Design a protein around this ligand. Structure first.
Ligand SMILES: *[C@@H]1O[C@@H](C)[C@@H](O)[C@@H](O)[C@@H]1O
Length: 299
């Protein structure tokens, strides 16, 4: 399958005459009918096996085709086809005069024909336009053509569908041959599998988006490689999840029992000496001249 494209570039008709030799009135308002068919050795009537396409009026007498027009460089004529491109082809381009605004073949008399141009060709699929020119009796047509794949199709038979996407169902662009290429951060057959933050822990962390690391229960840190201590744990750490290994100077299952109230709180004042107590928290031994709970009162 594919699409035959045809550009019409320039048409010369300096006498402004029909194929009959009679002058167009008031000038040749020129449109084109295009018939594309399978190659045959001798030009003979028969159906247009690749189809027909027609243009509006593109100019009068002699003219260069504007880029906007159907047939111009930015809007070429297109004949799509579903079967195998046979390489060789016969192409018929008819220049017609429009005596009015009705371009249908039923409205036109047969002597409105300006010229009939037959082209025998052989072409491979590809992006390059082949330029050519045909001079009839008193007219001349410059045109160019090529065969390409319809949009998002690739391969010499245009059988490979690729269209880029960046959503929940895939993250990729299309290479020239129609094969996926993943956007950065993604892998998997259809570029749906995220690549986690480098270092993400293979058991304790995972990702759903590229370059993140989500932790499984009991783990923390950017790489999900650090255990979480027990929910009640105070002055304690862990090696594996939910432990509570007390810091130096603390005890209990939740590492909240102060094993050195004196150092951790420094209650005593005026240079007194602190000692721990299980009944009263601590005791301050005053220097000479001081009294009180914390030796804060001067004797
Ligand atoms: C503890 O006792 C008090 C009375 C002060 O003499 C301190 O210097 C000492 O460490």
């Amino acid at each position: 399958s594919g699409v035959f494209q045809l550009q019409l570039q320039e048409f010369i008709n300096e006498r402004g005459v029909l194929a009959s030799g009679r002058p167009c009135e008031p000038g040749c308002r020129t449109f084109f009918r295009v018939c594309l068919k399978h190659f045959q050795a001798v030009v003979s009537p028969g159906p247009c096996t690749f189809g027909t396409v027609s243009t509006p009026v593109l100019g009068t007498n002699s003219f260069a085709v504007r880029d906007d027009s159907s047939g111009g460089g930015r809007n070429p004529l297109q004949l799509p086809f579903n079967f195998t491109w046979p390489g060789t082809f016969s192409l018929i381009i008819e220049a017609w005069h429009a005596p009015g605004d009705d371009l249908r073949p039923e409205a036109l008399p047969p002597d409105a024909l300006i010229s009939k141009i037959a082209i025998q060709g052989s072409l491979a699929v590809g992006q390059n336009w082949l330029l050519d020119e045909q001079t009839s009796t008193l007219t001349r047509l410059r045109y160019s053509y090529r065969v390409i794949c319809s949009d998002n199709y690739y391969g010499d038979n245009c059988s490979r569908l690729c269209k880029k996407r960046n959503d929940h169902f895939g993250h990729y662009v299309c290479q020239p041959d129609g094969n996926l290429s993943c956007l950065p951060g993604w892998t998997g057959e259809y570029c749906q599998q995220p690549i986690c933050l480098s270092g993400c822990h293979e058991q304790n962390g995972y990702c759903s988006k590229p370059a993140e690391c989500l932790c499984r229960p009991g783990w923390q840190g950017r790489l999900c490689n650090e255990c979480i201590p027990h929910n009640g744990c105070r002055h304690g750490t862990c090696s594996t999840p939910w432990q509570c290994t007390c810091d130096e100077g603390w005890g209990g299952l939740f590492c909240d029992q102060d094993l050195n109230y004196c150092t951790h709180h420094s209650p005593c004042k005026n240079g007194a000496t602190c000692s721990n107590s299980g009944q009263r928290s601590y005791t301050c031994t005053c220097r000479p001249g001081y009294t009180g709970v914390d030796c804060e009162l001067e004797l």
